[PDB]
Symmetry: D3
Subunit: 105 residues, 6 copies
Amino acid sequence: GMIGSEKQVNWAKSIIEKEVEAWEAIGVDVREVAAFLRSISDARVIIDNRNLIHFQSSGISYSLESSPLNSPIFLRRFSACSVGFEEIPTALQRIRSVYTAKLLE
Amino acid sequence: GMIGSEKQVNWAKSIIEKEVEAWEAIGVDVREVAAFLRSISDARVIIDNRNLIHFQSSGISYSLESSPLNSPIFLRRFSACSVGFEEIPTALQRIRSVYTAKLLE
Amino acid sequence: GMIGSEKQVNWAKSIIEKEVEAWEAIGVDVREVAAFLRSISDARVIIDNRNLIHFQSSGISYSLESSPLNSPIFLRRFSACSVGFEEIPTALQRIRSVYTAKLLE
Amino acid sequence: GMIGSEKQVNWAKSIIEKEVEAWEAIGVDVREVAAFLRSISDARVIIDNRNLIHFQSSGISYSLESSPLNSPIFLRRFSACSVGFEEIPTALQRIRSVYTAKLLE
Amino acid sequence: GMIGSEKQVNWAKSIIEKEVEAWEAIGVDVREVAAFLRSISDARVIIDNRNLIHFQSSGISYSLESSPLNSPIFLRRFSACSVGFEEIPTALQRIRSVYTAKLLE
Amino acid sequence: GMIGSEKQVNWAKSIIEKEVEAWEAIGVDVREVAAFLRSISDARVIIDNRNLIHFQSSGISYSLESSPLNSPIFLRRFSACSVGFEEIPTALQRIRSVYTAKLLE
């Protein structure tokens, strides 16, 4: 499973679940992003990036548009301890497109 | 299966099959679009949109370019009675790219 | 400038002014689209396309996203009687991006 | 031009000059971004956003890719006190494409 | 298996394996491209295009950016003797995005 | 303007005129590409790239789609001896979109 002390693994898992909850509160399919976050297997990387990745439930549109998960350069930091990072910028484009259309419809 | 009276289901199914036939007459892979159309599970939504979704076999290039299946806002109307709508704009981009290259080659 | 009979020219000019007013009611910069519409120099082409190009005030986002001005193929019909048609799909991407951001902000 | 108290204007002007210098240290054409920054006419808006917009010289590629100037939603806050904000996301795509090619060549 | 004489099949297979090796030396996931190349089932098409498809291990960034696998028109020549060509331009966009970010990070 | 020996300048100027004529034979607006070609100010750079840039009249669509003028990395070689190279990939997208629509219409 996730690498790190028992304290770090406990902390990292609560960070990931909090983020997955934020993404799932949007109301459109985010399964690909939730699976990516749950695949991150290094507690120290999760903890160090807990604030940088944070998704703000106030202002969903801006949170989606400005998320560092949009950035391939940012996602390199997960390249050795995650699954599916190569597709995550594409996934955010789709999610932004779907959520934007839901709001505008 | 599809929701609606027996008359509406019969009518909706003939609409969908007519559209699937139009898409399949293009001559490039359209399986993703055919599966999406066949997943629409509300006869009343199919009937109401039978003219808006219609694919004209005269002028395939323009039919592809102008199809409302290109539009995430339009596709919201299928969000609760279909499968795979989030990917359909992407699918049309690919199909347009493939068919255009076939014609130009 | 505008070619056509006196009645066609008068009708076409009024169609264009109506369309420009619809685009300018959005509330974001549409000067490039307004200039393109006012550059169309063939009354018959304007008249024949008066319904295909019509911009509906009732649903601005969908009017923008579904407008045939998004389509290079559609715009070919103005190629011999307008200025700036090559840039209009780009202009619509920009306007859609600006107006979408304004609504979501 | 710039609205605000004398101290706010002086602080805002120095913030903008600092940001322009950071962008101009990249070594590719950034004239459009420099012009946009120098067009912002509200000292309070500059001051309040001085950290959100700040361009870090230490990692140019990531600064470009993560800049909030990429975001139409973020730029809405300059819509009433600047010139050219509608084109700035496009400008950043171009600059990113040019600077990336220069580094990789 | 692959169509052609025993000599042509031997030659074509060595061409494909040499290309797959070049793509795999990049150091990012290229499985989709390797599978596409290994799906090409006509030795004569592989042999005729051995130089056009060649990936230069000197200058990986330019080889990726300039590869004819980016071009749907070029890929039409494999439409009847390959699997997955419709997705290959998309795959190159992703690979370019991933490798570029790895280098820039 | 153009640097080089008298023979190199004469050869380079004739190469550029040949290329401009090839681009202008397409029949859509290529003024921006023509201006860029005529802005190249180093005879040796033109001569060394005369075959890499050459535009073939026999297959216009593929010449457009495969042109190295699509590539920011390739264009870096003109960065110190031309005007407008940063916009040329965008220009080629536009020209490809216009010419494609003209053929398909």
